[PDB]
Amino acid sequence: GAMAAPILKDVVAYVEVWSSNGTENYSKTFTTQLVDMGAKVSKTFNKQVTHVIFKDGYQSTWDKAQKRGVKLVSVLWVEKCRTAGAHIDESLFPAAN
Numbered sequence: 847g848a849m850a851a852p853i854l855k856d857v858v859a860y861v862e863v864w865s866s867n868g869t870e871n872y873s874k875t876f877t878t879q880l881v882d883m884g885a886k887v888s889k890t891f892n893k894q895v896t897h898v899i900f901k902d903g904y905q906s907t908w909d910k911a912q913k914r915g916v917k918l919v920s921v922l923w924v925e926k927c928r929t930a931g932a933h934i935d936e937s938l939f940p941a942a943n
């Protein structure tokens with residue numbers, strides 16, 4: 847008899863999710879989902895960011911995440927956290943570049 851913490855408590859996410867052809871930015875779709883699970887979302891990739899949700903984004907974002915050891919996760923990671931109702935290991939659903 848105890849209620850769970852917000853699923854993505856303490857996650858501070860920057861979202862860069864584009865269509866493959868680069869014409870459409872879907873970052874708002876995923877910002878909303880993250881906030882509903884208790885993450886904070888930053889409009890900029892600043893020093894407080896812990897996670898970058900990345901799909902077909904900018905190479906500079908990829909390289910900066912790698913340099914800083916910020917977790918680079920796919921939109922599938924977001925889905926799988928929602929499905930599990932739990933903060934799933936980021937190693938399971940890495941982003942691809």
Ligand SMILES: [Cl-]
Nearest residue numbers: 933934935938
């Ligand atoms: Cl896990």
